Structures are given as C-alpha cells and as structure tokens.
C-alpha cells in the first residue's frame, strides 16, 4: 500500500507544480495586456 501511495503523492505534486507555472505565465501575459489596454484608455482620455 505504501508503494501504491507514494507514487500517487509524486503525481499530484507534479500536477500542482505544472499548474502553478501555468498561472504564473498567464498572469504575466494578462498583466501586460491590461497595461497596454490602460495606456490606450488614457490615450482615449486625451481623445476625450
């Protein structure tokens, strides 16, 4: 049973870490996108 269980523990840890990397990168990208959108919006404020 211990054999069965630690392999599962390793697998779940791998899934956790891969998911973490994923949101890290997605947050980076979406932050950039929001920044440029805000810049366009302030330029549209100039246009206002």
């Amino acid at each position: 049973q211990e054999r069965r269980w630690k392999v599962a523990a390793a697998k779940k840890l791998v899934r956790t870490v891969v998911r973490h990397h994923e949101e890290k990168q997605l947050r980076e990208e979406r932050g950039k996108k929001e920044e440029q959108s805000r810049l366009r919006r302030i330029a549209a404020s100039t246009a206002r």
Binding site: L39, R40, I42, A43, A44, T46, A47
Partner: protein, 324 residues
C-alpha cells in the same frame, strides 16, 4: 508664465509660446541625424541657447512642452525628462509625437500624416490621437536626397555652389528647390539668378530632380499605401479621407497635387481619399508647432503635463506613463 512650445525638428527648430500663433524663433537645428538626440551635450547646449538667446527667458519659470519623433526610442524620452528636469528645473513638462501635433494642428485626430526632415520621410497613421507604431513606414527618400540631386546637378553645372560655407552650400540647394523644382518635357523654364548673378536655363532638371522621391527605394506613394496595409483593416477608410502633409521638405510645386493623383490611382477609386491642403510653407513649417501650441494652451493641459512634482516622486518612468 505663458506656456512655451518648442519644436526641435531635425533641420530647423521652431520655438514659441503656446498662446501665440507662430513660433517666434525658427532657426536651423546636428544632434538629430537619425531623428533622435544623438549628442545630449550639443542637444543640451542648443536648448540652452534657446532659452537664453532665442526667447530670452529662464526655463525655470514657464511651463515647457517638447515634441518628439514617432519612431524615437524610449531611452531618449527617459533621458530627455532626466536631462530636462535636472538641468533646467521646469515646473511642468510634456512630450508628444510630432505627427500627433500635426493632426492636432489640422484639427483632425484620426488621420494619416506625411512629413520629411533630415534624412527621413515617413508615413504615420494616427487613430484617435494614438500613433500606430506598427503602421509607421520610414523611407530615406527625404528632401535631403532631392537636394543632393540638386547639389550634384549643380556640380555638373560646375558652379561654385568654414562650416558656414557648407551652410550656404546647403541653403542654396534648398532655396533653388522652392523656386524651381516642380513635379524638353518641361518647356522653357525660369531664369533663377544666384546672389553673384550666375544662373542657367534650368530645364528638365526641375522635373527630373523631384521625381526621385517617386522614382529615384520606396516612393512616398509606396510608403503610404503600405503603411495603411500594415494598420488595422476597417479604419483604413478613415485614414484615406484624412491624409495630411506637413514639413518644409514637402514644399515642392504640384507636389501635393501629384500625390493626390498617385494615391487616387493607387487607392481603390470607390474610396473617399482626400488630402488636406496645408500646402503653404507657413502651414507646413508651423503645422507641428501649431498643434503643440494648441495642446499646451488648452484648459485640460492643466492636468496633462508631468509637473515638476511628478519628477521628484518618480524618476524617468513618468515619461512612459503621462505621455501616450
């Protein structure tokens, strides 16, 4: 405290107050070979020469606005704010693209701009007051190229066309352009006289010299038609109905006219392509300064500058934050 608006253009500097119609000082610019400050010290010196000799007023009192090239690199802007605030200690600052001011001078936010200076002629489509960096097309077939045709075509004439003599040598080839260059196929021509009295019957040279910017490299028409290609798809009709021209280098006889034909025959005929005829030198020479002068004057400029305050609380980073 009347706001000061300076244009640091590549070949001449146009300087003046926000509330006045004309730049009170327009003198030759060099630290701006490529389009941005190549020599900060020479740049700083000519700026110093501006505040003291050209306008006879300290920079520490009036609010100040500077205009910059559309394609310029950021590092220039951060350093400019760094140099400007540190040395001159201005109360308020701002940076705007020359193309943006022209569209502001022409009272048309959404448009496409054609201008040329030292070594560069570019196409910049501006939408909603925003320059589409991706849409910019920069070509070398600037006025300098055409004048260099003039100079060589003068040297072949074998006329006698220290740095001041070079300034004179350059000044004449430009002056000849305004009088003569128009865009046996030209019929009898002018009798333009040099100050010493030398002259010649300037024949087809007046017609072939200007043709270089269309056909010496991307011609001005090719510069623009592609630029709109690179921009968005559906705003393109807006740009075509809003094309504008600025810059003293663009001052050639039937120039704007030939541009209309080249585009009218290149654009789809169904399009509403229109050129705004600010063809007068005074219009073209002031167009950039006019937009800046208007910009500084307005009552919402009171929140738009980078006050001296923003520069203490934040360093160079503010430039990217306050100026689109």
């Amino acid at each position: 405290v009347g706001a000061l608006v300076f244009d640091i253009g590549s070949y001449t500097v146009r300087a003046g107050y926000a509330g006045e119609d004309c730049p009170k000082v327009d003198f030759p610019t060099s630290p701006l070979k490529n389009g941005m400050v190549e020599d900060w010290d020479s740049f700083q010196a000519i700026l110093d020469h501006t505040y003291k000799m050209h306008v006879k007023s300290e920079a520490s009192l009036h609010p100040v606005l500077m205009s910059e090239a559309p394609w310029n690199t950021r590092a220039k802007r951060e350093k400019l704010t760094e140099l400007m605030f540190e040395h001159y200690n201005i109360p308020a600052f701002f940076l705007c693209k020359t193309a943006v001011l022209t569209a502001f001078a022409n009272g048309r936010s959404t448009g496409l701009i054609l201008d040329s200076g030292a070594t560069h002629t570019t196409a910049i489509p501006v939408h909603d007051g925003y320059v589409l960096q991706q849409g910019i097309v920069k070509s070398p077939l600037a006025g300098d190229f055409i004048t260099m045709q003039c100079r060589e075509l003068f040297q072949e004439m074998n006329i006698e066309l220290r740095s001041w003599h070079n300034y004179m040598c350059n000044c004449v080839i430009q002056d000849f352009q305004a009088s003569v260059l128009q865009v046996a196929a030209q019929m009898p021509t002018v009798h333009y006289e040099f100050p010493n009295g030398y002259n010649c019957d300037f024949g087809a040279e007046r017609l072939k010299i200007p043709e270089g910017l269309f056909d010496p490299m991307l011609g001005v028409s090719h510069v623009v038609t592609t630029s709109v290609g690179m921009c968005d798809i559906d705003i393109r009709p807006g740009l075509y109905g809003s094309v504008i021209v600025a810059g003293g280098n663009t001052l050639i006889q039937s120039f704007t006219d030939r541009l209309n034909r080249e585009l009218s025959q290149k654009t789809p005929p169904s399009m509403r392509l229109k050129l705004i005829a600010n063809n007068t030198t005074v219009e073209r020479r002031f167009s950039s300064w006019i937009g800046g002068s208007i910009l500084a004057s307005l009552g919402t400029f009171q929140q738009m500058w980078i006050s001296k305050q923003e520069y203490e609380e934040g360093g160079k980073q503010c430039v990217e934050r306050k100026c689109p």
